[PDB]
User: Fold this.
Amino acid sequence: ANIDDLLGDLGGTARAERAKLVEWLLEQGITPDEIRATNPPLLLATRHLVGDDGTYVSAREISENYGVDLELLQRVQRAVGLARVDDPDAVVHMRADGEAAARAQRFVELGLNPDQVVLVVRVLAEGLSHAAEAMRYTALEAIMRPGATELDIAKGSQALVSQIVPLLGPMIQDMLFMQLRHMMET
Amino acid sequence: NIDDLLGDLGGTARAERAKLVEWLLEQGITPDEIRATNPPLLLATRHLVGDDGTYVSAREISENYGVDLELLQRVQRAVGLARVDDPDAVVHMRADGEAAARAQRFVELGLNPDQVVLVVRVLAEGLSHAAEAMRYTALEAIMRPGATELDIAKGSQALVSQIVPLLGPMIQDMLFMQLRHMM
Ligand SMILES: CCCCCCCC/C=C/CCCCCCCC(=O)O
Ligand SMILES: CCCCCCCC/C=C\CCCCCCCC(=O)O
Assistant:
């Protein structure tokens, strides 16, 4: 009944299904802490498919790991809207997020204006967050089938999201180059 | 002779266009390509973003990539970049047609086609704003004191060549970052 503190204030059917979901999440190496911190837990087991392995890093680690400037790194993280956690020593950044933010540096190395570069991140992040919303709803519609236990959905999202992820990177990339092409001809 | 590529241009403007056309022809660009494109400036740069000059119809895309024509045309509308909604009109850049053809695979995995088409629409709109912020960013880096057409063309080709390899990986990383923070 360690699990009991993870079901929270839930009752009846919803508590028994959540208990099945929690048992399974624990076998997938999700810790009680990740489950308590994530409400609802349903898609904790799909997260590793989009690059969250549960490992964290500080801004200092990021800046030495990926060879980038800490000030610039901080500005980018703000633009993306992630971890306002201003302190550059707190180990509170998803590892994939630090890699992604460090790419900023190379555009500045080529002589692009640091301010314009942070701007582009800001604008891209705004657009993509809306697109991520609709994506989630889209995939939710697909997995959620009447008489679906919470565990049925979690397992079904693993199978579905697993198949979709390899297509998404190429898709968004094509969609960016489509805009660039038509901004050049335009 | 170039003269008809130069047209009504006179003065400094003709003299500069002559040097740009000169360099474009040795870059392997045809007089044909230069006429249709005004100004001809980004012609030796647009290949870097996947515009090779090839054009296709929605029907050819449909047949060549084995995707549903009707779904394909909804996706093209959702991107919102070419005005002809005629299956046989040859007005889609080849790379745009392939990109539109990817959408059906999401549908064969159980995603609802109305939701997919809407996602395309929302993505297209987010990316067009970024793309304009990118254009201004690129120009600032390229445009220098009293630059000629040709300096601009050379500067843009060098700069885009260096940036493009980075851009794909970057936008893809940004999408996944948003997907990690979905709650
Ligand atoms: C031409 C573009 C077509 C658009 C296709 C639509 C894309 C489908 C969206 C992706 C669904 C996967 C979302 C996964 C979210 C995982 C959330 C989590 O980390 O727990
Ligand atoms: C903080 C890191 C963000 C990095 C964002 C990358 C900045 C991209 C800016 C330049 C890429 C744009 C290339 C195409 C622009 C138009 C060029 C042209 O047609 O003249």
Remarks:
- Residues A 76, 104, 107, 112, 117-118, 120-121, 180, 184; B 42, 134-135, 137-138, 156, 160, 163, 167, 170 surround oleic acid (ligand 2) (CB under 6 Å).
- Residues 150-185 of chain A form the longest helix (36 residues).
